[PDB]
């Protein structure tokens with residue numbers, strides 16, 4: 219079992235409608251390769267101590283969150299951290315409820331002001347009981363902001379996140395460095411001040427939506443341009459839409475670069 | 489292939505956290521029986537004509553909606569109809585977007601005032617582009633109300649729904665009769681005026697949450713009491729929580745009564 223490490227699980231590596239889309243559209247993906255079946259983008263972050271006790275933090279709770287956690291085999295959760303308030307990253311939020319019961323404590327969630335204010339609007343009942351309801355709240359909100367590190371405590375010891383700003387079309391999203399692993403989904407440009415957090419990563423997990431330009435995400439070409447500049451030891455592509463077939467993208471990319479797949483899992487030193 | 493019929497698919501038959509819960513809790517369900525793996529409650533309703541053209545209507549779009557539709561093998565959708573605005577019935581709403589593109593038309597959705605006003609609050613961007621966004625709306629709203637039949641048109645011909653009031657703890661939910669098939673989820677009591685819609689069904693699909701009383705749902709015993717009173721030819725239990733194991737409930741219930749399972753599918757005459 220895992221010991222003395224951080225462990226990362228790519229819970230989902232698809233674009234907002236998943237692969238295939240709800241209408242059975244696989245695009246250019248080989249439907250016979252299980253790696254092309256893609257849930258919505260999310261990352262599990264764990265820290266294990268010397269006895270195998272873990273601290274568990276999820277990045278984003280999209281609609282696939284429940285199945286992602288079940289399939290991960292990890293049955294406890296200390297916190298959720300949010301990138302930005304788009305459907306595919308937040309609409310599985312209600313499923314945090316079970317852990318609140320298990321932990322005997324509100325679920326700590328971490329979000330910037332933009333994300334937090336949208337969650338309040340759309341999932342107010344998770345924070346405050348509305349008129350005419352008996353459901354207690356389930357979440358405890360913590361602010362995060364680019365360039366301000368924060369740490370989440372748990373049974374495995376603390377996990378320190380370094381958030382930073384990303385341009386995501388018409389809005390801002392957050393990326394995070396955790397040790398020498400960096401997670402950059404839903405990003406169309408990196409601001410100059412964010413570069414320090416993204417360069418020289420052991421593992422850079424970076425969104426590449428499709429081949430053609432898109433206003434809100436890097437194309438594969440743009441992602442690769444960034445990877446050449448930032449010199450990660452290994453890169454893993456995420457938030458991949460239906461034009462991007464696993465085997466195909468594997469061939470089209472340098473040896474140290476690969477398309478992700480759901481369930482992709484690795485350990486690193488702490 | 490189906491012809492000259494209505495076809496019903498039980499897309500999901502679980503309680504709000506699914507079976508197992510997100511933490512891997514199966515309760516008393518046999519984890520080795522695939523029928524005990526339960527997605528959130530939803531019903532697919534189709535009408536096929538003599539050439540196999542279909543009209544397709546979903547009841548509720550919970551978080552499992554995308555996988556439910558993919559697994560159903562049905563790749564088009566004419567409308568969504570809503571029972572009530574609880575997470576497990578609405579939080580997969582964004583995934584209607586693909587069909588809007590396919591159909592070239594906003595997705596017609598049907599909801600009562602209570603449900604509609606909550607959807608507006610929490611998923612406003614689906615109806616109206618907010619400040620600072622370029623995303624067009626995706627939904628077109630239609631009112632429904634107990635005791636007022638409504639029909640949805642499509643390639644297979646019209647599907648006529650007869651909505652009626654249900655008590656669901658502290659709120660009201662809707663049930664629906666479609667021909668001689670009746671769908672009653674999230675119900676703790678039936679008002680006297682609703683009884684005409686529920687009696688003498690060919691197939692009564694009725695929520696039974698667990699063995700012990702619950703303020704918002706019928707227990708198994710209460711569901712069975714109702715079934716004895718309403719004399720459906722066949723009953724199928726839905727919205728079943730982790731205390732209710734498939735094989736076990738199968739034995740505990742009369743011959744004409746069965747626990748549902750995800751993917752349960754039948755055709756009836758029009």
Ligand SMILES: Nc1ncnc2c1ncn2[C@@H]1O[C@H](COP(=O)(O)O)[C@@H](O)[C@H]1O
Pocket residue numbers: 233234235303304305306404434582585613618621623
């Ligand atoms: N105002 C909004 N709030 C939440 N989700 C949105 C909003 N506008 C669009 N979306 C959804 O957010 C996702 C955008 O996907 P992405 O291409 O991954 O940035 C899609 O699921 C959209 O339908």
Ligand SMILES: Nc1ncnc2c1ncn2[C@@H]1O[C@H](COP(=O)(O)O)[C@@H](O)[C@H]1O
Pocket residue numbers: 312315343348351353503504505573574575576674704
């Ligand atoms: N105000 C609310 N709006 C939407 N969903 C809610 C609200 N309050 C509770 N819920 C969720 O609705 C579901 C209630 O489940 P049920 O037992 O099937 O009626 C659970 O997912 C709750 O977390």
Ligand SMILES: [K+]
Pocket residue numbers: 467468469470471472473474475476
């Ligand atoms: K490669």
Ligand SMILES: [K+]
Pocket residue numbers: 737738739740741742743744745746
């Ligand atoms: K039986």
Ligand SMILES: [Mn+2]
Pocket residue numbers: 233234259304306307404457
């Ligand atoms: Mn996204």
Ligand SMILES: [Mn+2]
Pocket residue numbers: 302304386404
């Ligand atoms: Mn996004």
Ligand SMILES: [Mn+2]
Pocket residue numbers: 503504529574576577674727
């Ligand atoms: Mn429910």
Ligand SMILES: [Mn+2]
Pocket residue numbers: 572574656674
């Ligand atoms: Mn409910």
